Amino acid sequence: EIDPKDLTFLKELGTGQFGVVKYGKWRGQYDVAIKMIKEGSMSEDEFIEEAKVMMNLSHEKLVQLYGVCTKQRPIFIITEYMANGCLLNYLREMRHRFQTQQLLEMCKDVCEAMEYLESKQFLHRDLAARNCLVNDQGVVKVSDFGLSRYVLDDEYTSSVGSKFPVRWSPPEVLMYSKFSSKSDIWAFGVLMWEIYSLGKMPYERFTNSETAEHIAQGLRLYRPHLASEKVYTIMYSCWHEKADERPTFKILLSNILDVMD
Amino acid sequence: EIDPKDLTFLKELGTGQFGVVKYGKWRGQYDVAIKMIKEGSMSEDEFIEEAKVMMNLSHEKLVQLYGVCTKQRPIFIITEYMANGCLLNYLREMRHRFQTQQLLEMCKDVCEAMEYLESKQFLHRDLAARNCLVNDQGVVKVSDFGLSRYVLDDEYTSSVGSKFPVRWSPPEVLMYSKFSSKSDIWAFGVLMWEIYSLGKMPYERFTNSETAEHIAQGLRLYRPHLASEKVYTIMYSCWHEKADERPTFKILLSNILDVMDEE
Amino acid sequence: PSTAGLGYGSWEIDPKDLTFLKELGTGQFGVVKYGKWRGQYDVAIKMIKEGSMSEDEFIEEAKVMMNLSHEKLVQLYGVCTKQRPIFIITEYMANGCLLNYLREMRHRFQTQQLLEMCKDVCEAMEYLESKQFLHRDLAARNCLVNDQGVVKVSDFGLSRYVLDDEYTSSVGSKFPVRWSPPEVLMYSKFSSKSDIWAFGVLMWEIYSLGKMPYERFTNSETAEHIAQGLRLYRPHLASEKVYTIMYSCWHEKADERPTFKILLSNILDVMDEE
Amino acid sequence: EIDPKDLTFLKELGTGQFGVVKYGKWRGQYDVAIKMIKEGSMSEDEFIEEAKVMMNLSHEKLVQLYGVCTKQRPIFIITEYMANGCLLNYLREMRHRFQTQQLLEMCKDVCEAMEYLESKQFLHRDLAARNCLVNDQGVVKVSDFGLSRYVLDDEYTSSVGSKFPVRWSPPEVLMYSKFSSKSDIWAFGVLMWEIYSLGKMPYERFTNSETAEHIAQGLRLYRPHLASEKVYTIMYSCWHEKADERPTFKILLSNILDVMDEE
Numbered sequence A: 001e002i003d004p005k006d007l008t009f010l011k012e013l014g015t016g017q018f019g020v021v022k023y024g025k026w027r028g029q030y031d032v033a034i035k036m037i038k039e040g041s042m043s044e045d046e047f048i049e050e051a052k053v054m055m056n057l058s059h060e061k062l063v064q065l066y067g068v069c070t071k072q073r074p075i076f077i078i079t080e081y082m083a084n085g086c087l088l089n090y091l092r093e094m095r096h097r098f099q100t101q102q103l104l105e106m107c108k109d110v111c112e113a114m115e116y117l118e119s120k121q122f123l124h125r126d127l128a129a130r131n132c133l134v135n136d137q138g139v140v141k142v143s144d145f146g147l148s149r150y151v152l153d154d155e156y157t158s159s160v161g162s163k164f165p166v167r168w169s170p171p172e173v174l175m176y177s178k179f180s181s182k183s184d185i186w187a188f189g190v191l192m193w194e195i196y197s198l199g200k201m202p203y204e205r206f207t208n209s210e211t212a213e214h215i216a217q218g219l220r221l222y223r224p225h226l227a228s229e230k231v232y233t234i235m236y237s238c239w240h241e242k243a244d245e246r247p248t249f250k251i252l253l254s255n256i257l258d259v260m261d
Numbered sequence B, D: 001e002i003d004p005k006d007l008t009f010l011k012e013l014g015t016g017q018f019g020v021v022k023y024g025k026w027r028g029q030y031d032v033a034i035k036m037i038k039e040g041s042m043s044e045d046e047f048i049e050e051a052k053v054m055m056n057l058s059h060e061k062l063v064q065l066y067g068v069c070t071k072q073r074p075i076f077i078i079t080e081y082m083a084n085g086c087l088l089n090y091l092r093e094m095r096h097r098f099q100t101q102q103l104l105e106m107c108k109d110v111c112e113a114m115e116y117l118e119s120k121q122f123l124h125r126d127l128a129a130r131n132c133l134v135n136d137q138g139v140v141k142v143s144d145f146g147l148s149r150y151v152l153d154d155e156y157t158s159s160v161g162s163k164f165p166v167r168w169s170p171p172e173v174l175m176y177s178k179f180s181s182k183s184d185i186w187a188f189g190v191l192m193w194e195i196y197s198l199g200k201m202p203y204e205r206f207t208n209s210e211t212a213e214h215i216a217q218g219l220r221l222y223r224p225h226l227a228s229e230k231v232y233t234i235m236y237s238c239w240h241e242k243a244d245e246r247p248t249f250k251i252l253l254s255n256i257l258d259v260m261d262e263e
Numbered sequence C: 001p002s003t004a005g006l007g008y009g010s011w012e013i014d015p016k017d018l019t020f021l022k023e024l025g026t027g028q029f030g031v032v033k034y035g036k037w038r039g040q041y042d043v044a045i046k047m048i049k050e051g052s053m054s055e056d057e058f059i060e061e062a063k064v065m066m067n068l069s070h071e072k073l074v075q076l077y078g079v080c081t082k083q084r085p086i087f088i089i090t091e092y093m094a095n096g097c098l099l100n101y102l103r104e105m106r107h108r109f110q111t112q113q114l115l116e117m118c119k120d121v122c123e124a125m126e127y128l129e130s131k132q133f134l135h136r137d138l139a140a141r142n143c144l145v146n147d148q149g150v151v152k153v154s155d156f157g158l159s160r161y162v163l164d165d166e167y168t169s170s171v172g173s174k175f176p177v178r179w180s181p182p183e184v185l186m187y188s189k190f191s192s193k194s195d196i197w198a199f200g201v202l203m204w205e206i207y208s209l210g211k212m213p214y215e216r217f218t219n220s221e222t223a224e225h226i227a228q229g230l231r232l233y234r235p236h237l238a239s240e241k242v243y244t245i246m247y248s249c250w251h252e253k254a255d256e257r258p259t260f261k262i263l264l265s266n267i268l269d270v271m272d273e274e
Ligand SMILES: */C=C/C(=O)Nc1cc(Nc2cc(-c3cccc(NC(=O)c4ccc(C(C)(C)C)cc4)c3C)cn(C)c2=O)ccc1C(=O)N1CCOCC1
Pocket: D013, D014, D015, D016, D017, D018, D021, D033, D035, D063, D079, D080, D081, D082, D083, D084, D085, D086, D087, D089, D126, D131, D133, D143, D144, D147, D148, D151
């Protein structure tokens, strides 16, 4: 719960699924991003009671949420800042000409966060590159975890809506709307592909409708040019037909660790 | 050698590095493709002189040489016709909608062919999907083997020419132009990638001179969409930096089969 | 970028009203699919792949294209630009590519049928010529057939927007060398008259029932030799009267080539002569 | 058309209805302000095809449009640069404390501009001190005249919108969306009130809904303290309920000129 005395508004980050997001300083001290929830976008009545659970999710590879402004419509959601912005925007730029070692740490940065969330029995529900944000330390973090539950937008919420993350959804979500820890695993593997493909669109020559059938039909994404054969086996592992035969994040962390050292 | 009196020139099959290619009937029964070897394209003495070592080569998966015509200028080279045409054009097509089991088998037909050459100590020196043709039965065959030896274009034979097969070549060729079966091995792996990717150009967004630097800095290609985790493993194995650590075609054919038992 | 603020109107289609049904193959801009719009209309939908198109240029300028309406053009319904990839939505031609249709030895024409195909295209081209719009890649591969067997011209003026160096440059692998006049090959001088040159070649493609022009030569050899005045011979199933029309398209001097209007008049005269 | 290669982007000047505006220089010389038009904020096709009429509007007291950059996105609109910024701020300074003569001279500058637009059958349609700028010479000039027509925002275009200029609109605009020379006249009187009140908001203790209701009941702005009776008579003449009894900018300029000789 953040009083707005601390809150200065400096520059705007973008307008997101919940409307406008801003960056400033909270406490004239700790740099923040500032979600200014647009009215009617969010199930705030749902969000408020949860919010304790969400505030008690602490990890260094998570974009922590410092607090809320509940004594206003809009509500303000305050998060830590990532000054290097979108993972996707970052991945695409070849100016780094990113090293393979780099991309792998980037997967590790995420797996770390997801392992924590997994042990918290907490689901992202929408794990993608776009929902990852990079900081001044070149460190990538997971954002907007479990906030999908409160989206009021029929295109987003619905499995055939314009906004539903079909390309990150496992066989079961697409069919039975069955979200589990393992549906989180399916998305992480696709993120891994996004990272290795340096910002390429998954299934880019398929539409959302077509993607959703051929996922059932059994086909899968490529091994991106920069992935080793092992590095691929790890991502592909996320993609087992039966969800109970996919690894946990914990498992994926060990496989990833093996590869580095 | 063939009597040119037994060749009838029918349709066109386009043009090649030594010029035009035709299709015809040899003796009026064997349907054949004739190369006509244009002026200055080929090292002509130092062709027919080895030719018997290219001629005597026979395998189910190589496109068969039938002969030549050398008493005449330009010389003819007479080869087995392939209906289903270019691997690279065959591959791309929607009408096939290629099954992954279909790609690996096509990888098997190519590897079988390469292994036989390996046995007979015969380099190809330009292996790629552009250099494979498809018969009526969707059988893949490798052609034009050894012909890179006699080519009289510098752009083709010079590492940096605007023809040189840069995207299909190993570090030891790109930097010191050293050819063995292992640079023929490097070529197969890229070919697998071509097949699994349905006709994508390798290293598409890098130019030939750029790629020639980049592969020489350690990196490679993306295992294609339809490429399995184990399937990539084979194709990758071909791209070892030290040529010794790359596999033989004989091992590859086994590895492919062992995926074949399962997949 | 998108179409907002540009006054496209109904040309900016809401993709929610699109159904995707089958793949149709790939072109220079990537995948194309077949589908329905509003549950009522057969369409083809291009999905513009990344890096393939000068999207900013296309969007600013595409209102001219959308306003092209002729029964012999494969007309554009509209675009979806509030998203990526962009969708280009056009009418569906059920009988597909012209060359396969011609090459179909399963179908055997009267020659009068081939001339009618030439007329259809000429009519499409005369219209474009009237609107001062260059097609820039007229070729049989870029012609489609409806279920009445009518031939229509596709993908006019979209060449402007390709980013592939090899397609754009006259020295490139994908450039339409066999359909280009000397002034295009030597000087990159595009005009209504390069479209005329191409049309003559297209007529040759039709009357040869789908042969590739100059195919004994490479792209670079063809370029060199045309500049040396090489011209295509008369297809066997082509009369001298017909051959004369296509041949007229190939005068070395652009100014001496006919207009599409002149060509249409010539084609009608042959039809009506005999 | 302006070649943007000729333009430098040297300072940001905040954000308007169409988005960001920046300070810059044109061809090394001219000081310029550049509107970078936000996508979907403007009906750009409509503006462009009438834009010539605007460009040619030439008067000393108008913020001159110099040109446009449209072979692009975002589109640019390039104008004269005004150093002392928006009038409303300038007025709200006792850092500058005006004589009343300065205030009247401000009214005359605007009235001169309006008389010219009025002569061109061109409506401003959003005249207010917010849309008036002051150059380094202390001249007030009218800005963004006619650009209201091209706004894509129902909040601004709708009479009951949150952004609509309710406080500057005559009853026939509020009731009937009837814009004319006479609507610009009413707005001008409100603008004179803004000037003499040193930037107070008109009808301050009423909301837009209240203001509309009440002006139809005949509520009128009171005489600002620095405004003489003769000046108040002039602004008030702007506010007749019946549009055809409001003066012209020609008549208003004459009255202002008369006060200046005498007062
Ligand atoms: C107002 C604070 C101030 O002093 N600003 C300032 C301005 C200038 N010069 C200047 C500014 C602008 C400008 C900048 C932003 C936004 C707009 N408005 C629009 O673009 C716009 C208005 C209305 C409409 C409607 C269609 C009517 C709704 C549409 C768009 C404008 C106009 C434009 N020009 C040409 C300028 O010259 C300079 C300096 C300042 C300033 O900040 N200071 C001046 C000196 O003391 C320091 C502060």
